[PDB]
């Protein structure tokens, strides 16, 4: 393989041959790679239409050049809760607060997260604004797992060898098929999952992803434009499981819930986004109480899915997460995981 | 205007707005654009599919930034014989011989020109190993011109800051518009021209951009591939006349041409084509003598249209041409060249 021959097929608006996306990522990872043929690799895949396979490939080479985590340290049933970010909403941290909820609920998590990109307020930017240790290694995620029933994989610390395309996705500004592939690659390998996907187009060929590796994934696109799902309308979720793909549109106002705003959702700065944080685990009722427990239930869905029916499975997700708050189980676990940091 | 928003807008499959394709490029020569931001731009505008406004635009832009002849130095009826290269053939430099045979029947001739990108010898190496000077500034240029009666502007002398653009297309290594604009940047700015393209798809473009200007040019894509009025077979012309453009397929057998095998135009290195240079001006008859004769015919038709009726200025352009070598005006222009850049 070489550039001229991958970058030649792309831009005839031809799929790649097998291996060859892999050979390109490697390059990459390597740093091997001029970042103009990054950029021309980045977008030309993006403009031809990736395809799952394709994009099965790119992840994998990251996850191949990736840290693990230490032998028998991930429970199989591990379930992310994480999204492509890029929906251009500024939102309070919906994953992230989520995923806490999730965990204190009883189900690991082991959540991949990054700082900001074109938001205010990162899951990461957020969670060290709660006093949340971040930057742990490989030994030390795997100990929080253990010890608190949750886990954070920095994405910077756990795939160094991504700094090359991290530097030319910032140059370019747009996204690109990159953009889908932090939460195709989480290094602890969880098997179930809440993905967020921003680009509608694209949510389909992540779902594809996920399929192939016979994950047990909702796939979640708000219509509304957030790569949550959302309370403001209806959402579209790729259910994946068994190995296939079912495309599904989710409606909240079947379980109750009141159409909220975007501007409900709003979030600021770390500071800001903390304190809604603190507010929703100390029993806030409203919007962004009513978006956390939806997502939350939506990550119990996707562990359920590691074995049944849809709408059971809701209303048991539903029920979990909103005790899982009104018990105040959430808020000490985020007690006990800032203080899981402060003790080394 | 911004990279995130002009590429954002390639990537969603949309023309841009007017101005956008002219402030990218006059980003990228002067040197303010990253590597990773022209290489996006190049390969995202290559696969929208670009349009004549735009190609025009990046054309602009360019003979904005290069330098110009010195007033009142270049013929208002100069012609241009050049193409985009890459046929992916090999040949000999039929657009550089058909040039020496036209200035030798009295049209004024400014070349641009360009060594090897895909090929063993572009006509800018043929003409260095001639003894040819080929890196002379306007001044010089201007002289060539009315002491010899043509004028080659090799494109890295004239074009100083495409050389950001240059570099991430040799590193990218595959063709895009950029690939384009060669022949539609010519510093001098002859009206008329013989214009190969490689690209069937892209021909009408470039025609377009030339009509923009209400140039008398033929775009033509022999139907064998070459970026010539191919002997092998017909070519398709682009007629640009009186601002507009009409499609028409040109057989030169209806001139008496007798078909040729693309081998027999086979070409090599500097050396060999030099000696094929001298070859065709010394009278050899047989295939590439054919080939030089109908291009240089071409071009001569496009400078008659500056005024010109078809059939009898093809007639009358195959005579000239042919008598041009005939006589060995072509071969003594040549010598006269050689000469005058001896001579400072
Ligand atoms: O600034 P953006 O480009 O829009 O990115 C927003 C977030 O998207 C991902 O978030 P994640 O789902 O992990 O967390 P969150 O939903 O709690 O913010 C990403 O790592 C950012 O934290
Ligand atoms: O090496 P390539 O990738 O095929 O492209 C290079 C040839 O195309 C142009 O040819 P021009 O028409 O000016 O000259 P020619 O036809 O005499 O070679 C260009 O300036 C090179 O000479
Ligand atoms: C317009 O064509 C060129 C302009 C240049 N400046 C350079 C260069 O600087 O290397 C190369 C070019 O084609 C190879
Ligand atoms: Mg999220
Ligand atoms: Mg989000
Ligand atoms: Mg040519
Ligand atoms: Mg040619």
């Excluded at 799952?52 to 809760?81: F, R």
Aim: proline residues 5%; negative net charge; charged residues 20%.
């Amino acid at each position: 393989p070489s550039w001229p021959q991958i970058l030649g097929r792309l831009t005839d608006n031809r799929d790649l041959a097998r291996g060859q996306a892999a050979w390109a990522m490697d390059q990459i990872m390597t740093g091997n790679a001029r970042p103009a043929q990054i950029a021309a690799f980045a977008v030309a895949m993006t403009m031809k239409a990736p395809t799952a396979d394709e994009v099965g490939e790119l992840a994998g080479v990251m996850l191949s050049h990736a840290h693990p985590l230490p032998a028998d340290t991930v429970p199989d049933d591990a379930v992310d809760v994480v999204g492509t970010g890029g929906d251009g909403v500024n939102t309070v941290n919906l994953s992230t607060m989520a995923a806490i909820v999730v965990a204190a609920a009883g189900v690991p998590v082991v959540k991949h997260g990054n700082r900001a990109a074109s938001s205010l307020s990162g899951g990461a930017d957020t969670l060290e604004a709660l006093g949340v240790r971040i930057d742990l290694g490989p030994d030390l995620v795997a100990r929080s797992l253990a010890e608190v029933g949750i886990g954070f994989c920095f994405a910077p610390r756990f795939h160094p060898s991504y700094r090359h395309a991290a530097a030319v996705r910032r140059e370019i500004g747009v996204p690109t098929v990159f953009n889908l592939l932090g939460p195709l690659t989480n290094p602890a390998r969880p098997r179930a999952g809440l993905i967020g996907c921003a680009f509608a187009d694209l949510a389909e060929v992540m779902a594809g992803v996920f399929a192939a590796r016979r994950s047990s994934v909702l796939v979640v696109h708000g219509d509304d434009g957030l790569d949550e799902l959302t309370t403001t309308t209806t959402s579209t979720i790729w259910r994946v499981a068994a190995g296939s793909v079912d495309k599904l549109t989710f409606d909240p106002a079947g379980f109750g819930f009141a159409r909220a705003q975007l501007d409900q959702l709003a979030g600021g700065d770390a500071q800001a986004n903390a304190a809604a944080v603190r507010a929703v685990l100390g029993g806030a009722r409203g919007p962004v109480r009513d978006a956390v427990v939806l997502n939350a239930a939506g990550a119990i869905v996707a562990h359920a899915g590691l074995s049944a029916e849809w709408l059971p499975a809701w209303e048991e997700g539903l029920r979990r997460a909103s005790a899982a708050i009104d018990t105040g189980a959430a808020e000490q676990l985020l007690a006990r995981w800032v203080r899981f940091g402060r003790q080394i």
